[PDB]
Amino acid sequence: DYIPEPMDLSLVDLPESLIQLSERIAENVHEVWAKAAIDEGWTYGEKRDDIHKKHPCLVPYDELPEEEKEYDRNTAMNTIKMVKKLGFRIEKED
Amino acid sequence: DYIPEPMDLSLVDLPESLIQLSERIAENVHEVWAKAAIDEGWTYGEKRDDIHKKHPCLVPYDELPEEEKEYDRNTAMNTIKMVKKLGFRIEKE
């Protein structure tokens, strides 16, 4: 009975200078995810195994398959778009 | 040989009005993850099963274990804090 219905953020516009940095951000979220997992005893394995706490994405963000990177970048942009949609202003400083 | 070293965003300060909305954001990010997974053939299962594409967190955001909700909120906050550290102003309009 559960149908996910994310908000339409398609017409939400971000500063290009911010989108240019999507990898920095995505890489940073990846680092946070990885430090945590590793802190809970996870380690790299080619196959994912919950029993031996083994994960194939526990590698430097750069080693990640490009679709994982793509996913992380989009997730980050969605997060920020959502902030904008909630009545907040984002602008580069000076 | 890989040691994650995330940026220290401890001293990054966000508007309280935004942090107040952290669940809303976290819920939306969850919906997006969920629509995708389901689009790729995943469904709910008590136990995660990659072979049968079964996932426990394919439930309405509200029904999630509190630790997952908590993880999602912090992730979102980290994300937004990262924007701030990169030289951007975030302010309620």
TrEMBL record, chain B:
Residues 2-92 form the Ryanodine receptor Ryr domain. Mg(2+) binds at D50. One of its GO terms (biological process) is calcium ion transport. InterPro entries: Ryanodine_IP3_receptor (IPR015925), Ryanodine_rcpt (IPR003032). Signal peptide: none annotated. Keywords: Metal-binding, Receptor. One of its GO terms (molecular function) is metal ion binding. Coiled coil: none annotated. This is Ryanodine receptor. It comes from Bacteroides thetaiotaomicron (strain ATCC 29148 / DSM 2079 / JCM 5827 / CCUG 10774 / NCTC 10582 / VPI-5482 / E50).
